[PDB]
Symmetry: D3
């Protein structure tokens, strides 16, 4: 298998582009330091917002936005190539369509300096997050030591359907960059269930904040394919490492019978209809019975406009 | 709200209809005694296989099968009306289609001795369970103290999409009657908690106890808050798990929460309604995993079950 | 110090005096077997209702009641003398005043065969328990290994003022015999710890097992340090023994030496303001009264079918 | 109910009055930031010593002392008014009587800038604390979402009698602001026991540590009325948040029979004398432990304090 | 790897040989039933004293002693061959030297029905156990799924030097069959975890649950090679702890690891080969604690045993 | 008994002798301040590398090494005498043999300023640590409140034989100063087992930080039966508790069924344990040594021939 490393990267305050650049260099220095301290490490992970922070007053402005790929991702690509590692990074990506809000984007770069995975946050943390829903789906790429990497972003991990989708497309190591975190206990909970439901590893790491900007939030969790937590970090700069053996997870999906739950879902050769009776979500008409009387269905509580479009530029 | 009671019933060792009748009367006596011990109790839950046991050599035979409803469920209904409680029971149900295998069925009976919910196990615990996949979907019913009750069966609770479905239909107290375990033990506690948190509903779950000729111990009755917090936990046989459930707070959270209102976020990424979902594999009945060709267990032959389907084990 | 044993005793169903006699001999059998297994043990503890069970339809009748002292307590005394141990026993005691309901009584017998502590449950578990509120206060007696023993009964241990009371009179080893539960499981572990830490004393606590005609799975069994740290934890099975060594002198030293965390002293010496403020001493004057008493749903035993006019009933 | 917030404020090192004003502005800037991050929060709580720190060499000097009310409490009140929240603050209060040491004082301010609760620490953390014993008893006030708030200060929370007193006067949400903590495990323990003993919620938060470098000294906790821990802080600006439902603690006190312990204490309609028929000492002011004669610490001379009383450390 | 099962077997009182023979059939009935319940199981593990119990008044008598191998071990071997599993059994063994006390013995049998490992308890649980110190050392044998099996007996597991020894001979799966406890309960879980981590091997442990006529002493445990508990008996008689063991992962770590390869570090601190401890004395048979003169228990007189050695209790 | 204090000391970054001097004064100020806040404390413990840090580029250099004893140890000694406490300190010690690498040394200083214990780490954390294997064995001294103190250093604590060795020589309070920590869980695990195996207390504390900003690297007091009594959760976090070594002494004298340390040599029992033997003769050899990937320090860029390097 392989050795993974997740950094409970702290996020200081961000007030300008030079602070974003300062973060970028800091992330790169960390990546080289981590490789020097753990020579065997092949995958190094940074949390969501590590590049840009969470300045809600400026985080939609063009100054605070980057392109993917771009000169900043190329610096990360440069860093991965000479350190000879896979790296996971966070970019608040400028939308190619200027009338839409920016995306919340995660990328995985290989030891050759190539972006091999690009994911845009499918489930933004509403109502606080103004990011446009991702349009690239849940992609999977080839990782080190026989791993099939997929990455989700913070809130995404609370949606078991998304963990199912990654594993459906072949993922055996599910990465979750963050983060939150009023949700601390449920973050531990979902990292374990995401693992167990789909017979895959989960490697997760949260940022470290309060305002949310005091250097203490992220946990850093490694879960076995059976849901058992192998490594647990506390609440900045805390590094969570551990050996991952994706093959044991792959074998479990092949040999297991009784609790092969991911297979059971489609083969109750079993009944191919799960009920799904007379599948709303698939047709885009997912509707809860209590939607009419809900209090929060827009971002007005956080000061955002309700008509949508581009804002905060 | 209301007070619930989950009984970690000892798995019976069953060799005939006579033993099945002994179990029913034992369940009935336990129900009346739980009411006597807890006068404010409104929901008494029994686990999967508490009526018929797990005699794998015999459990497909007609002698070991009951109709739902039938003479046996009416005896449960009488007890419920006499005790004035909601009751959750388990019956291995004779398939009205004599060319198909029996269902694994759960029923909820109200304080007036009427069946208000009937659920057929959607996900049998393959490959050990030869039950036919349920055809009734996931139903929801009115319960005590403003609750909307739904019930799943052991293995069913390992499927997050099913807990989503119950909630999608208005369920705020998710019931899991179970006949595991000692190999899925830690994950049984995990899923009971995740099923709650994912959908902002209470989960009330209980497993049986003695599944051999004896071995009277599995249990682990569990009550979880809508935020995934475990309120009450059993260890162990005849262990009773009681707690007060306040379903109104779960309903209010669904209405008032924003940041962690995940059950809403799923359909409103008014958000992008398509979750990608880039069509509908499961919905179109073509759910297929890339590693399916090399899987070892895709039938029941490992437990000696025929692989051509139809009715077997009479 | 000394070695302690707490038995998560299973009480079968009691339907007659014969069954009570069977329980007595079984408890005696258990005491001698525990001494043989643990030759160093000096304190053996049996839970509430271990003698007479919890037949709520017959437990108020004369057949189900004993005298303290009586012919049965002297069987316990004989066993304790033969084995040379301190023993803790439970007896539902017939009230000498025949116009009143019976007490829920606990006793401690010394290795000399004498009753050295007699306690009547001060706080019955209302509304399910019909026992008369005990009139003997909270007594403290001398024990083995420098220990000063006091015993409370199940529901008693949920009252922090009672744990205070025992310690206030010298107790360093707070014993809790119990017949719960499965609705107070977590809170039983909680209060066994808090009762210890509040007063800088050890707590040794044990609960029963069964009632429903074949069952027996209720108890826990717990030994806590004087700072509230749990040392030994029994599970929930019948016959489960909880053993551990107790060093009572260390608890006493903590009460003498400690300054910052000496909370039992701080209560009366805020040489400090002697008035705790405490600015209506209601409980002391017997006029303790909660603001929501008018609107309470359960203030008698009618929910369980008990007469609401007091006196003697259930004979 | 209502959404509460507890901030594990970092202990400031204080050397002058400027540093105190620096803290006040920091607390005010933290309060407005919490409201912005959680638009639904109605109660933001700060720990003991958040305003003035723990400079034991200077914490008795008039420079380090404020009045309640004063211009500093009016700054907190102005902040509460502008943010529209209830706020809990700490003030080392100058004693209006000149022959007595300063008080350790907590105040609750409502969304209109009114101080609706003033409490002086009844049990100072002796022998390290020189504060005069409080004289205002244990007050209770109305809060948001139908709550009845009461506050104790750090050491006060180790005294169950005080938790009992708060509840006795109607409190359903017991607040504990703190500047501990060599008592870490017993902090979590007593936070749960205070809740359960009295059938009320507890919300507790501790300051974060002294010495110009150390800034991380304790936890932060929310407990349900049954003692169950709901949220747990687990270092400086950690924010502990959770939704509180006080009416269902009220309901428990009205509904419960078996474990309605707070009622059982007075009605063992029960015997009114707790018996307590031969240890009724604290009422008359005659509390006396049998071992008081041999105690090693009964004054503050271990930390350099004088032993004859009066005003000192000026 | 392979699937392992550990049964928290109960043993009732034993009063005669007819009870011992009843135990053997029960163990054999359980073995076939476990294989039927778990078709993939390759290792079935029974606890210490599961064959003969702990009648301390008769366990030294000829009536209570068996030969290893012998007619009774043949019954175990036949059962293993029929079920096609490895089996681990417990036998109190008549000493081939009739002038010395019996041994406390454990055996492993392969699916072909052959004894491939025999071990005699090196550290009897003094002073309560009268068994003779084992003379066969700590053996290792080949098991299923690339495992190198070794077995220790209850009290043997509290001695870290023995766990080191097994691994030193190749063991990657350290089995602990046990007949404690409830006075060493917490430390049993501890040592199983440390025994694994110290030597980078799996530990599979199980205790008897019954020896009195309290059938609840067991606590089956599977630990990962880094100390992590994977499955925990939790607990009761007839409770079966199951889990998949992947021995090659432990072997790889011993080959690949650098920073925590402690088993290698011990002898190569190419390192200083002399550890510089020399209590390692023990090698020369001079192990001597500085406080032996003042110890209370150095014989079995407290349990009534004579202090002259030789054969007794016959 | 006595009161103990363990400081989860943060180590900032060390780039010069000046920084080391700053570390020394910080420790001294912390020692006096802990005495002030806890006037009843008699043992204050500082973690491994608190004096010199972990600059792996320079930590073998002559600038970064001190002599034991030296004027830096006499600064600590002066502080212990003025505060009247026992102190435990870390020193990376220049090897008197200039052809060999420096030791990783721990010292205990009493209230008289006397170093009563000097321990050179027997088990350097290979392959990352280049320190020379200690030659002073596992020493034991007389501590406060009836204690017999021994000190092991970080990685030493994963070796139960060493914990056995300390106890064998009388130790009833086993101190572990540490600069880990990827092994956070196993650290808590071994602190408990070291205690239970030998019927002695264990007081342990790990360092905190080095990454130019990072400080939060993993403080534990365990009872003689292995039960954790106090557990730290910060850089600068102080772990305190009262230790009663007499109760540990008594258990060793009193216990029968539970006396494992005695049983090891008295299976009067069989004195042969039943071949540790290879280790005594210096021939400890694992069957899988030939296929191991890490038997030197080339993974971290160290030379593989021994001698003096990094100076």
């Amino acid at each position: 298998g392989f050795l993974v490393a997740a950094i409970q990267f702290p996020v200081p305050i961000v007030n300008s582009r030079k602070d974003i650049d300062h973060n970028i260099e800091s992330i790169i220095r960390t990546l080289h330091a981590t490789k020097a301290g753990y020579p065997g490490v092949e995958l190094i992970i940074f949390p969501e917002y590590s590049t840009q922070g969470l300045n809600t007053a400026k985080w939609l402005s063009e100054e605070f936005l980057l392109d993917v790929p771009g000169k900043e991702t190329e610096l990360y690509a440069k860093a991965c190539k000479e350190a000879k590692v896979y790296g996971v990074f966070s970019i608040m990506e400028r939308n190619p369509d200027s009338n839409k809000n920016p995306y919340n984007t995660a990328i995985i770069i290989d030891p050759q300096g190539e972006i091999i995975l690009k994911y845009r946050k499918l489930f933004p943390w509403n109502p606080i997050e103004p990011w446009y829903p991702g349009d690239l789906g849940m992609p999977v790429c080839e990782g080190p030591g026989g791993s099939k990497l997929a990455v989700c972003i913070s809130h995404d991990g609370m949606i078991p359907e998304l963990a199912r989708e990654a594993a459906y497309k072949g993922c055996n190591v599910y990465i979750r960059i963050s983060g939150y975190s009023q949700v601390n206990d449920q973050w531990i909970l979902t990292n374990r269930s995401n693992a167990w439901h789909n017979l895959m590893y989960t490697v997760s790491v949260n940022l470290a904040g309060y305002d949310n900007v005091f250097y203490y939030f992220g946990e850093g969790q490694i879960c076995n394919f059976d849901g058992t937590t192998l490594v647990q970090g506390h609440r900045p700069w805390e590094i969570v490492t551990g050996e991952i053996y994706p093959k044991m997870a792959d074998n479990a999906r092949l040999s297991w019978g009784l609790e092969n739950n991911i297979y059971n879902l489609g083969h109750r050769g079993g009944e191919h209809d799960a009920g799904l009776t007379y599948k709303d979500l698939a047709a885009g008409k997912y509707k809860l019975p209590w939607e009419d009387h809900m209090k929060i269905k827009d971002g007005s509580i956080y000061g955002y406009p309700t008509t949508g479009g581009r804002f905060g530029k």
